[PDB]
Structure formats: C-alpha cells, structure tokens
Coordinates of N, CA and C in Angstrom, one line a residue:
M1 N 2.5 -0.5 17.3 CA 2.1 -0.2 16.0 C 2.5 -1.2 14.0
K2 N 1.6 -0.9 13.6 CA 2.1 -1.4 12.2 C 1.5 -0.9 11.1
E3 N 2.1 -0.9 9.9 CA 2.1 0.0 8.9 C 1.3 -0.9 7.4
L4 N 0.7 -0.2 6.4 CA 0.5 -0.9 5.6 C 0.6 0.1 4.1
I5 N 0.8 -0.8 3.6 CA 1.6 -0.1 2.3 C 1.0 -0.8 1.3
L6 N -0.1 -0.1 0.5 CA -0.8 -0.4 -1.1 C -0.2 -0.3 -2.5
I7 N -0.3 -1.5 -2.7 CA 0.4 -1.5 -3.9 C -0.8 -1.9 -5.3
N8 N -0.7 -0.8 -6.4 CA -1.3 -0.7 -7.5 C -0.6 -0.8 -8.7
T9 N -1.0 -2.5 -9.3 CA -0.9 -2.5 -10.6 C -2.1 -3.5 -11.2
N10 N -1.7 -3.5 -12.6 CA -2.6 -4.2 -13.5 C -1.8 -5.6 -14.4
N11 N -0.3 -5.6 -14.1 CA 0.3 -6.6 -14.0 C 0.6 -7.7 -13.1
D12 N -0.5 -8.7 -13.9 CA -0.5 -10.1 -12.9 C 0.9 -10.4 -13.1
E13 N 2.3 -10.9 -13.5 CA 3.3 -10.9 -14.3 C 3.7 -10.8 -12.3
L14 N 4.4 -9.0 -12.2 CA 4.3 -8.1 -11.3 C 3.9 -8.6 -10.1
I15 N 2.8 -8.8 -10.1 CA 2.2 -9.2 -8.7 C 3.1 -10.3 -8.0
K16 N 2.9 -11.4 -8.0 CA 4.0 -12.5 -8.0 C 5.1 -12.6 -7.8
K17 N 5.6 -11.2 -8.6 CA 7.4 -10.7 -8.5 C 7.1 -10.4 -7.0
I18 N 6.5 -9.4 -6.3 CA 6.0 -8.3 -5.7 C 6.1 -9.4 -4.3
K19 N 4.9 -10.7 -4.6 CA 4.9 -11.4 -3.5 C 5.1 -12.4 -2.8
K20 N 6.4 -12.9 -4.0 CA 8.1 -13.3 -3.8 C 8.9 -12.1 -2.7
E21 N 9.3 -11.1 -3.5 CA 9.6 -10.1 -2.4 C 9.2 -10.0 -1.0
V22 N 7.9 -10.1 -0.7 CA 7.4 -10.0 1.1 C 7.6 -11.1 1.2
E23 N 7.6 -12.3 1.0 CA 8.0 -13.5 1.7 C 9.3 -13.4 1.7
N24 N 10.5 -12.6 1.0 CA 11.6 -12.7 1.4 C 12.3 -11.6 2.6
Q25 N 11.0 -10.8 2.7 CA 10.9 -9.5 3.8 C 10.8 -10.1 5.2
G26 N 9.5 -10.8 4.8 CA 9.4 -11.8 6.1 C 7.2 -10.9 6.6
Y27 N 7.0 -10.1 5.4 CA 6.0 -9.1 5.7 C 4.4 -10.1 5.1
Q28 N 3.6 -9.8 5.1 CA 2.2 -10.8 5.5 C 1.3 -10.3 3.7
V29 N 1.1 -11.4 2.6 CA 0.9 -10.4 1.4 C -1.0 -11.1 1.5
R30 N -1.8 -10.1 1.8 CA -2.9 -10.1 1.2 C -3.5 -9.2 0.1
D31 N -4.3 -9.9 -0.6 CA -4.7 -9.4 -2.5 C -6.5 -8.9 -2.5
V32 N -6.3 -7.5 -2.7 CA -7.8 -7.3 -2.8 C -7.7 -6.9 -4.5
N33 N -9.3 -7.3 -4.8 CA -9.6 -7.3 -5.9 C -11.1 -7.2 -6.3
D34 N -11.7 -7.1 -5.0 CA -13.4 -6.4 -4.5 C -13.4 -5.1 -3.4
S35 N -14.7 -4.7 -3.6 CA -14.7 -4.2 -2.7 C -15.4 -4.4 -1.0
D36 N -15.6 -5.9 -1.3 CA -16.5 -6.3 -0.3 C -14.9 -7.0 1.0
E37 N -14.1 -7.3 0.1 CA -13.0 -8.4 0.6 C -12.5 -7.1 2.0
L38 N -11.8 -5.7 0.5 CA -11.0 -4.3 1.4 C -11.8 -4.5 3.1
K39 N -12.8 -4.7 2.8 CA -13.4 -4.2 4.5 C -13.8 -4.8 5.3
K40 N -13.3 -6.4 5.0 CA -13.3 -7.9 5.4 C -11.3 -7.7 6.2
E41 N -10.2 -7.4 5.2 CA -9.6 -7.2 5.6 C -9.2 -6.3 6.7
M42 N -9.5 -4.7 6.9 CA -9.4 -4.0 7.8 C -9.9 -4.6 9.1
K43 N -10.8 -5.3 9.0 CA -10.8 -5.6 10.2 C -10.2 -6.5 11.1
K44 N -9.5 -7.3 10.4 CA -9.1 -8.4 10.7 C -7.3 -8.1 10.9
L45 N -6.8 -6.6 10.1 CA -5.7 -5.8 10.7 C -5.8 -4.4 11.7
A46 N -7.5 -4.3 12.7 CA -7.8 -4.1 13.9 C -7.4 -5.3 15.1
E47 N -8.0 -6.0 14.4 CA -8.3 -7.3 15.6 C -6.9 -7.9 16.0
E48 N -6.1 -7.6 15.4 CA -4.5 -8.6 14.9 C -3.4 -7.4 15.4
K49 N -3.3 -7.6 16.3 CA -1.6 -6.3 16.8 C -0.6 -6.3 16.7
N50 N 0.2 -7.7 17.3 CA 1.6 -7.8 18.1 C 1.5 -9.2 16.5
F51 N 2.1 -8.8 15.3 CA 2.4 -9.3 14.7 C 3.0 -8.5 13.1
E52 N 3.4 -9.2 12.3 CA 4.0 -8.4 11.0 C 3.2 -7.7 10.0
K53 N 3.6 -6.3 9.8 CA 2.9 -5.4 9.0 C 2.6 -5.7 7.4
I54 N 1.7 -5.9 7.4 CA 0.9 -6.4 5.7 C 1.1 -5.0 4.7
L55 N 1.1 -6.0 3.8 CA 1.2 -5.5 2.2 C -0.1 -5.8 1.9
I56 N -0.7 -5.0 1.1 CA -1.8 -5.2 0.2 C -1.7 -5.0 -1.4
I57 N -2.1 -5.6 -1.9 CA -1.8 -5.6 -3.6 C -3.2 -5.6 -3.7
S58 N -3.7 -4.1 -5.1 CA -4.7 -4.1 -6.1 C -4.7 -3.8 -7.3
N59 N -5.8 -3.6 -7.4 CA -5.8 -3.6 -9.2 C -6.4 -2.0 -9.6
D60 N -7.4 -1.8 -9.0 CA -8.8 -1.4 -9.0 C -8.5 0.3 -8.2
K61 N -8.6 1.0 -8.6 CA -8.3 2.9 -7.5 C -9.6 2.9 -6.6
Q62 N -10.5 2.5 -6.8 CA -12.1 2.7 -6.0 C -11.7 2.2 -4.8
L63 N -11.2 1.0 -4.9 CA -10.9 0.4 -3.2 C -9.9 0.4 -2.7
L64 N -9.0 1.1 -3.0 CA -7.5 1.8 -2.6 C -7.6 3.2 -1.7
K65 N -8.7 4.0 -2.3 CA -9.2 5.3 -2.4 C -10.1 5.2 -0.7
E66 N -10.6 3.7 -0.9 CA -11.5 3.6 0.5 C -10.0 3.8 1.6
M67 N -9.2 2.6 1.3 CA -8.6 1.7 2.2 C -7.6 3.2 3.1
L68 N -6.9 4.0 2.3 CA -6.0 5.1 2.6 C -7.1 6.0 3.3
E69 N -8.6 5.9 3.8 CA -9.2 6.3 4.7 C -9.8 5.8 6.3
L70 N -9.6 4.6 5.4 CA -10.2 3.8 6.5 C -8.8 3.0 7.8
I71 N -7.9 3.4 7.3 CA -6.2 2.5 7.9 C -5.2 4.1 8.6
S72 N -6.5 4.5 8.0 CA -5.6 6.8 8.5 C -6.7 6.1 9.7
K73 N -7.9 5.9 9.5 CA -8.9 6.1 10.8 C -8.0 4.2 11.8
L74 N -7.9 4.0 11.3 CA -7.4 2.4 12.2 C -6.2 3.0 13.2
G75 N -5.6 4.0 12.6 CA -4.3 4.3 13.7 C -3.3 3.8 12.9
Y76 N -2.8 3.9 11.3 CA -1.9 3.0 10.9 C -0.9 3.9 10.0
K77 N 0.1 3.7 10.4 CA 1.1 4.1 8.8 C 0.6 4.0 7.2
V78 N -0.1 4.8 6.8 CA -0.3 4.4 5.5 C 0.7 4.6 4.3
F79 N 0.7 4.2 3.4 CA 1.3 3.7 2.4 C 0.8 3.8 1.0
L80 N 1.3 4.7 -0.4 CA 0.3 4.2 -1.2 C 1.8 4.1 -2.4
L81 N 1.5 3.7 -3.4 CA 3.4 2.8 -4.4 C 1.8 2.1 -6.1
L82 N 2.2 2.7 -6.7 CA 1.4 2.6 -7.9 C 2.0 2.7 -9.0
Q83 N 2.0 1.7 -9.9 CA 2.5 0.8 -11.1 C 1.3 0.3 -12.4
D84 N 1.9 1.5 -13.5 CA 0.6 0.7 -15.0 C 1.4 0.8 -16.2
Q85 N 0.8 0.5 -17.1 CA 0.5 0.9 -18.5 C 0.5 2.2 -18.9
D86 N -0.7 2.7 -18.0 CA -1.4 3.8 -18.4 C -0.6 4.8 -17.2
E87 N 0.6 5.4 -17.7 CA 1.2 7.0 -17.7 C 0.0 8.0 -16.5
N88 N -0.8 8.2 -18.2 CA -2.0 9.5 -18.0 C -2.8 8.8 -16.6
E89 N -3.0 7.6 -16.1 CA -3.9 6.9 -15.4 C -3.1 7.4 -13.5
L90 N -1.8 7.1 -14.0 CA -0.8 6.8 -12.9 C -1.0 8.5 -11.6
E91 N -1.0 9.6 -12.5 CA -0.5 10.6 -12.7 C -1.8 11.6 -12.1
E92 N -3.2 11.1 -12.8 CA -4.6 12.2 -12.2 C -4.9 11.5 -11.0
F93 N -4.4 10.0 -11.0 CA -4.8 9.2 -9.5 C -4.5 9.6 -7.9
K94 N -2.5 9.9 -8.7 CA -1.8 10.2 -7.7 C -2.1 11.8 -6.8
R95 N -1.8 12.6 -8.0 CA -1.9 14.6 -7.8 C -3.0 14.2 -6.8
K96 N -4.2 13.8 -6.7 CA -5.6 13.6 -5.9 C -5.4 13.3 -4.6
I97 N -4.7 12.1 -3.9 CA -3.8 11.5 -3.1 C -2.8 12.5 -2.2
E98 N -2.1 13.3 -3.3 CA -1.3 14.0 -3.0 C -1.8 15.6 -2.4
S99 N -3.5 15.7 -3.0 CA -4.2 16.8 -2.4 C -4.9 16.2 -0.8
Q100 N -4.9 14.9 -0.9 CA -5.4 14.2 0.1 C -4.8 14.3 2.0
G101 N -2.6 14.8 1.3 CA -1.5 14.9 1.7 C -1.3 13.0 2.0
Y102 N -1.2 11.8 1.2 CA -0.9 10.8 1.2 C 0.7 10.9 0.9
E103 N 1.5 9.9 2.2 CA 3.0 9.9 0.9 C 2.4 8.1 -0.2
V104 N 2.3 9.0 -1.7 CA 2.3 8.3 -2.4 C 3.5 8.1 -4.1
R105 N 3.9 6.7 -4.5 CA 4.3 6.8 -5.3 C 4.4 6.2 -6.9
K106 N 5.2 6.8 -7.4 CA 4.6 6.7 -8.7 C 5.8 6.0 -9.6
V107 N 5.3 5.4 -10.7 CA 6.9 4.4 -11.8 C 5.7 3.5 -12.5
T108 N 6.9 3.7 -13.7 CA 6.6 3.2 -14.8 C 6.4 1.8 -14.9
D109 N 8.4 1.4 -14.8 CA 8.9 -0.1 -15.1 C 8.4 -0.3 -13.7
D110 N 8.3 -1.5 -13.5 CA 8.1 -3.1 -12.8 C 9.2 -3.0 -11.6
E111 N 10.2 -2.7 -12.4 CA 11.4 -2.5 -11.3 C 11.7 -1.7 -10.1
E112 N 11.2 -0.6 -10.8 CA 11.0 0.6 -10.1 C 10.4 0.3 -8.8
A113 N 9.0 0.1 -8.5 CA 8.1 -1.0 -8.0 C 8.4 -1.1 -7.1
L114 N 9.9 -2.5 -7.5 CA 10.6 -3.7 -6.4 C 11.1 -2.9 -6.0
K115 N 11.6 -1.9 -6.0 CA 12.8 -1.2 -5.2 C 12.2 -0.7 -4.4
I116 N 10.8 -0.1 -4.3 CA 10.4 1.1 -3.3 C 9.8 -0.3 -1.9
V117 N 9.0 -1.6 -2.8 CA 9.0 -2.2 -2.0 C 9.9 -2.7 -1.1
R118 N 11.0 -2.8 -1.8 CA 12.1 -2.7 -0.5 C 13.0 -2.2 0.0
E119 N 12.3 -0.9 -0.3 CA 12.5 0.7 0.4 C 12.1 0.6 1.7
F120 N 10.9 0.5 1.6 CA 9.8 0.4 2.4 C 9.8 -0.8 3.4
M121 N 10.5 -1.1 3.4 CA 11.2 -2.2 4.3 C 11.8 -1.8 5.6
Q122 N 12.5 -0.8 5.4 CA 13.5 -0.5 5.9 C 13.1 1.0 6.5
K123 N 12.1 2.1 5.6 CA 11.8 3.4 6.0 C 10.3 3.0 6.6
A124 N 9.8 2.2 6.9 CA 8.2 1.9 7.5 C 9.2 1.7 8.9
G125 N 9.7 1.5 9.2 CA 10.6 1.6 10.9 C 11.0 3.1 11.0
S126 N 10.3 3.4 11.2 CA 10.4 5.3 11.7 C 10.1 5.4 12.7
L127 N 10.9 6.7 13.2 CA 11.1 7.3 14.9 C 9.5 7.7 14.7
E128 N 8.0 7.0 15.3 CA 6.9 7.5 15.4 C 6.7 8.2 16.5
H129 N 6.9 9.5 16.4 CA 6.8 9.9 17.2 C 4.9 10.1 17.8
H130 N 4.6 9.7 18.6 CA 3.2 9.4 19.0 C 2.2 10.3 18.9
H131 N 3.0 10.9 19.7 CA 2.2 12.8 20.0 C 2.6 13.6 18.5
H132 N 1.9 13.0 17.6 CA 2.2 13.3 16.2 C 2.1 15.0 15.8
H133 N 1.2 15.6 16.5 CA 1.1 17.3 15.9 C 2.1 17.6 17.4
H134 N 3.6 17.5 17.2 CA 4.1 18.3 17.5 C 4.7 17.7 18.9

C-alpha cells in the first residue's frame, strides 16, 4: 500500500517549511508546477511499489484535480490539503472535491497546514480493509 497527500499552497516560504517536515518524517517530496510533470509522476508512483509514501506539493488546482482522479485509478489512498491567501478560492474548490467524495482539508494559517501534514503521517497508517466495499 502507498498513500498520496496533495498540498495546495501559493506561499513559497511555506512550501520549503513543508519539505523540511516531510524530510523529518522520511516521506518523499515531489513538486508539481506544470501539467506534463504530474502525468510523469503518476507513472513513477505506479512503477515503484515497495518504498515510502509520497507527498506532492502544487500551487495550481487544475493539476491537483487531475491527480485526485489519476491516483484513484492507480489504487492508492488519496488525501488533499489546501491553504492560500484567498479563503474564497479555497472553499469553492473544496466543496467540489467533497462532491467528488474525497478527504479534503482547508486552512487559513500556514501553521494549521503543517499540523495536518504531521497528522497525516500517523493517519495514513489506517486499517486498509482491502475488500473496501464492506
């Protein structure tokens, strides 16, 4: 089993703070800031099974929205966490992702995002009942 957590932040300084946390936990940092980069990454994740679970950072919603569906085909734990200066932009994206039926978190402060990054590190180790439809 492998878990994929997607972070959405436009705050450059936070992106680096997250990377520090992810290196402290031992998770694999990969940056996506381009539409061609994400479809490369999805294959790398599929080809390599037995190693640490990956943390993807991005600033663009159109990228993330692809990967929520792609990773869902690949057969992994999808997780979404988003924070930005525009609260209006956070909530309008999130409500659509809840309508897709995905675990998506929303925060205002960068500190709250860092909490949920650390929370994921234990919450990702869930009892994955593989026969997942009861």
